[PDB]
Design a binder for this molecule. Structure first.
Ligand SMILES: [Mg+2]
Ligand SMILES: [Mg+2]
Ligand SMILES: [Mg+2]
Ligand SMILES: [Mg+2]
Ligand SMILES: [Mg+2]
Ligand SMILES: [Mg+2]
Ligand SMILES: [Mg+2]
Ligand SMILES: [Mg+2]
Ligand SMILES: [Mg+2]
Ligand SMILES: [Mg+2]
Ligand SMILES: [Mg+2]
Ligand SMILES: [Mg+2]
Ligand SMILES: [Mg+2]
Ligand SMILES: [Mg+2]
Ligand SMILES: [Mg+2]
Ligand SMILES: [Mg+2]
Ligand SMILES: [Mg+2]
Ligand SMILES: [Mg+2]
Ligand SMILES: [Mg+2]
Ligand SMILES: [Mg+2]
Ligand SMILES: [Mg+2]
Ligand SMILES: [Mg+2]
Lengths: 113, 138, 181, 39, 261
RNA sequence: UAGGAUAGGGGCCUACCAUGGUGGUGACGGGUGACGGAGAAUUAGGGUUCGAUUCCGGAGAGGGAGCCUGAGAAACGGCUACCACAUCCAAGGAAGGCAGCAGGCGCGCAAAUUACCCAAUCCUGACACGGGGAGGUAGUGACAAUAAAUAACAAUACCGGGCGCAUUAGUGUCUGGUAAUUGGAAUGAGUACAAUCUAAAUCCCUUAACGAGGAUCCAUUGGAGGGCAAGUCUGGUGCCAGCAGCCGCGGUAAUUCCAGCUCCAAUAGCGUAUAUUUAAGUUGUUGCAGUUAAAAAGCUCGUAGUUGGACCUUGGGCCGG
């Protein structure tokens, strides 16, 4: 029995997204997963694609029952691909990650040719 | 009495400057000899014990205050250093590494002890209080 | 290294003469009546009160019609009337000197709880504040020195989650019931 | 030096009880209050 | 040092950039441009901090190299461009114009305009004097230069520059009795009509100004910027018509704001 | 003055001429455990001390000196030479510079990680795109600062003061304490599904089932002659050991030592040590003192310094609130 409201909401067709600060109120509930918020935001904005949502920076205020955070609704998944930082895509699983070992990442390799 | 002229600011600043020297504490701090003293402007000073000696006590009292001659490893001075408490001297031993703290009274000898300004607070890197109160033995 | 630049200071100063029967008894009076955790708690109040009183004194040194005086006096009396520390018609900037640590200990949420009831004791009040039991508007305040304002006094009350008036019982209740049934 | 530790060794050894904790923090000041000037 | 300093740490960034203390070590460091880098506002501070069209450094980079942003009528890919006073920013994707104006507190505002009151900009002249082959030209404080200037235009005057013919359309002769909008010092922001101008041999010539509602101040010739001839300015002034009001009145206005709400 | 050199003024240098410049208003020299400043501590006012340090300016790369490339370097995460130091050597030669991050030796009273990341702030490149030990995050962290647990409420009880009468009672009201008393309540310290956080993990903030009987989920640091709040308690010691910042305790009835019980002070802090500010009107400009306590030159002349007698119309007014 949880609620869902937004504020500080602005649409910029520069980066082709609608960006908001959501103010979720979940009395009794421990907290709400970002995935669990995805379907509610998607069905209240009928975004036609529940993958165009990227929501983050959740807090769960002192005392519990109310959490804040940012949200990003894109209007073409193409623009979601291009105007996004690399890690929210990985969080939603839209791309995968690799690891580094930087001995002669460049140093020894700057010697031979 | 005072020069209260309006244009005598030079005279009064120079007077206070010359007369600030007849104050003992100022002369002691701004003459530099703390840097010829054994700590040479130090809080504590670590050293090595040469022998536990024992020195008499001033006339109103009567005792053998158990002091240790130590040598300072930072500058080579040798000094005396009280070992404060009942029986606690025995934990000290010759050529053990001891931290010489101030004994109090800000660089001037304290109590009935003649010519001692320094106290031992650590030996072999273990708290001398800890050995007195059997908290942590060396 | 930024995060270096974040200021921070102190909240009190220890008294000059450590050992006097008169000051020591006065401090024990205040700590006993307002149920404090130690006399650091008392000692903060005098620091804050000294700061505000000195602010008032510097103003009263100057003259009326001075824009600084009017502005800061208006602000100061607004601050005090918001915490219910000066009364009606007593917006004068001379009754802000007459305030004393009685008045600041009068506003701590321990005192407000005990005077609103709901506590049965002031030392009961402090703990009841600390076991996440009382909100103010809708947020639980677990600070015994919350300094409740007058437009917040009317609606201090129990939780929506605490055993006394909110929802589920405590763990000892649920243990007793589970071994009773 | 032969007399170092003299009285420290002379004194007999005596051991404590298990005095019940006197409550710390707030309750300690409660007891000081209602022991000094409510009693 | 041995060369140009290219980092600007956050606490050295001028007071009127309003940027917070603990958000990081550095500040955008405006590039050497058309405005004096002490009296400027970079495009990142325009997009990110004020308009919130982005939320990071890279997001403003995305905004700018989409080619969306326009300065003085021509697209700009720079991200520490030192915009200044009466630079116009258009965003044709949003069909939306800003003209970058002070307020009375000394900070920049983005005062909106329509297109007819955006086709031109407005700036003063640093100096008018000769060049190659004896052709006169003038140099503004905007960096801009104009060749064959109208032989009446003198130094300290102000001109309007259309963004298509790219030359004068009119000029206001810096004189007593026309309104200014001071752009430096403590009085910056406050509009008002000159009542006097006193000159001293060998140093700065000061201007005495009055806020149209009575208050009177003075400032040296550097920071005055005549807007319009007479009392009527030729630019749409910000929300508060260039009147700096005492802090007491800023209290009364907020009391009056809350007491009707 | 004439010129050279420089990006340019200039004794920056040369030739010639002149003999000047500074100095009791402290030059020059000497000391500095002296980079300068914004500022830090203390502050009734005046002041006193400090300022390596993250912001700005300067300087320096082991000590000096000289240079190329370049708009910018007398650059050292560039070179050339010398001095100090040291490395590899197949014995010919060659390569060096952590006052960058991390780390090791040493010095010392005295100072953490040989971790992760470019996600944030900004810079940099031919550049949306790479790089960034700048920077940020996690680890040690009682440098300092903040909030803040270690119990609360009840009736029984030997009690203990009014108040129901006060007499003569008795018990009775705020519950004061010794109650491992008796009892059901509450909770987080900790543990833990998760979720959230995060560039990825983690701390936190939220929260499922755990998680309290006072021995435990146990609070200490310094004292109890005065200054200074709190023992004319009990045993030992016998001017010994020892305490004691000062005064003093200790030589057989020790409130001071050493210990047990009790109490006090602060209490997650508290003592010791040195430097320093207040106290200190004992540095006195505000604000000291010089008959006798420390202190008027033996006396006069005296140049600079300091200080300087009275006098010169805004004298009576209209005016508008
Ligand atoms: Mg004596
Ligand atoms: Mg540098
Ligand atoms: Mg730039
Ligand atoms: Mg010449
Ligand atoms: Mg030096
Ligand atoms: Mg620097
Ligand atoms: Mg070195
Ligand atoms: Mg250099
Ligand atoms: Mg060099
Ligand atoms: Mg190096
Ligand atoms: Mg290092
Ligand atoms: Mg003792
Ligand atoms: Mg004792
Ligand atoms: Mg005493
Ligand atoms: Mg006493
Ligand atoms: Mg002591
Ligand atoms: Mg004593
Ligand atoms: Mg003296
Ligand atoms: Mg003195
Ligand atoms: Mg005197
Ligand atoms: Mg005499
Ligand atoms: Mg004379």
């Amino acid at each position: 029995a949880v609620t869902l409201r937004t504020r500080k909401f602005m649409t910029n067709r520069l980066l082709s997204r609608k960006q908001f600060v959501l103010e979720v109120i979940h009395p009794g509930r421990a907290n709400v997963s970002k995935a669990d918020l995805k379907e509610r935001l998607a069905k209240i904005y009928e975004v036609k694609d529940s993958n165009c949502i990227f929501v983050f920076k959740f807090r769960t205020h002192f005392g519990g029952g109310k959490s804040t955070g940012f949200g990003l609704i894109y209007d073409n998944l193409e623009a979601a691909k291009k105007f996004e930082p690399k890690y929210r895509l990985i969080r939603n699983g839209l791309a995968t990650k690799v690891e580094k070992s930087r001995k002669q990442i460049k140093e020894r390799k700057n010697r031979t040719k | 009495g005072k020069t209260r002229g309006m244009g005598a600011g030079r005279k009064l600043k120079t007077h206070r400057r010359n007369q600030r020297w007849a104050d003992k504490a100022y002369k002691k701090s701004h003459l530099g000899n703390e840097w010829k003293k054994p700590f040479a402007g130090s809080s504590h000073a670590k050293g090595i014990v040469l022998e536990k000696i024992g020195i008499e006590a001033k006339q109103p009292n009567s005792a053998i205050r158990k002091c240790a001659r130590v040598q300072l490893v930072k500058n080579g001075k040798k000094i005396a250093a009280f070992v404060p408490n009942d029986g606690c001297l025995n934990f000290i031993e010759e050529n053990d590494e001891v931290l010489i703290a101030g004994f109090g009274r800000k660089g001037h000898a304290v109590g009935d002890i003649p010519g001692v300004r320094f106290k031992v607070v650590k030996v072999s890197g273990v708290s001398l209080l800890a050995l007195f109160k059997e908290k942590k033995e060396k | 290294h930024v995060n270096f630049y974040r200021n921070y200071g102190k909240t009190f100063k220890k008294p000059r003469r450590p050992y006097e029967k008169e000051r020591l008894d006065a401090e024990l009076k205040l700590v006993g009546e307002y149920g404090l955790r130690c006399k650091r708690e008392l000692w903060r109040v005098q620091y804050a009160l000294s700061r505000i009183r000195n602010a008032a004194r510097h103003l009263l040194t100057l003259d009326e019609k001075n824009p600084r005086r009017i502005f800061e006096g208006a602000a100061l009396l607004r601050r005090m009337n918001r915490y219910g520390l000066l009364a009606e018609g007593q917006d004068k900037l001379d009754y802000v000197l007459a305030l004393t640590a009685e008045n600041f200990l009068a506003r701590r949420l321990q005192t407000l709880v005990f005077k609103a009831g709901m506590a049965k004791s002031i030392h009961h009040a402090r703990v009841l504040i600390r076991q996440r039991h009382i909100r103010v508007g809708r947020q639980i305040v677990n600070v015994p020195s919350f300094m409740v304002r007058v437009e917040s006094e009317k609606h201090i009350d129990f939780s929506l989650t605490s055993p006394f008036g909110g929802g589920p019982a405590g763990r000892v209740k649920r243990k007793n019931q589970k071994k009773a049934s | 030096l032969a007399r170092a530790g003299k009285v420290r060794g002379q004194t007999p050894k005596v051991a404590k009880q298990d005095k019940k904790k006197q409550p710390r923090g707030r309750a300690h000041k409660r007891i000081q209050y209602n022991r000094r000037f409510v009693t | 040092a041995r060369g140009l300093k290219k980092h600007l740490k956050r606490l050295n960034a001028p007071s009127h950039w309003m940027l917070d203390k603990l958000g990081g070590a550095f500040a955008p460091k405006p590039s050497s441009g058309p405005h004096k880098a002490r009296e400027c506002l970079p495009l990142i501070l325009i997009l990110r901090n004020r308009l919130k069209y982005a939320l990071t450094y890279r997001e403003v980079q995305s905004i700018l190299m989409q080619r969306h942003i326009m300065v003085d009528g021509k697209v700009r890919t720079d991200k520490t461009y030192p915009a200044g006073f009466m630079d116009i920013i258009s965003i044709p994707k949003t069909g939306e114009n800003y003209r970058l104006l002070y307020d009375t507190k000394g900070r920049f505002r983005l005062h909106s305009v329509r297109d007819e009151d955006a086709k031109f900009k407005l700036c003063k002249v640093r100096s008018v004097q000769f060049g190659q082959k004896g052709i006169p030209y003038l140099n503004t404080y905007d960096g801009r230069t104009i060749r064959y200037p109208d032989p009446l235009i003198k130094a300290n005057d102000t001109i309007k520059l259309d963004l298509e013919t790219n030359k004068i359309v009119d000029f206001i002769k810096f004189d007593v009795g026309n309104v200014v909008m001071v752009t430096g010092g403590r009085n910056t922001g406050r509009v008002g009509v000159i009542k006097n101008r006193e000159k001293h041999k060998g140093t700065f010539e000061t201007i005495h100004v009055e806020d149209a509602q009575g208050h009177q101040f003075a400032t040296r010739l550097g920071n005055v910027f005549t807007i319009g001839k007479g009392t009527k300015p030729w630019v749409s002034l910000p929300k508060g018509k260039g009147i700096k009001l005492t802090i007491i009145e800023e209290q009364r206005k907020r009391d009056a704001a809350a007491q009707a709400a």
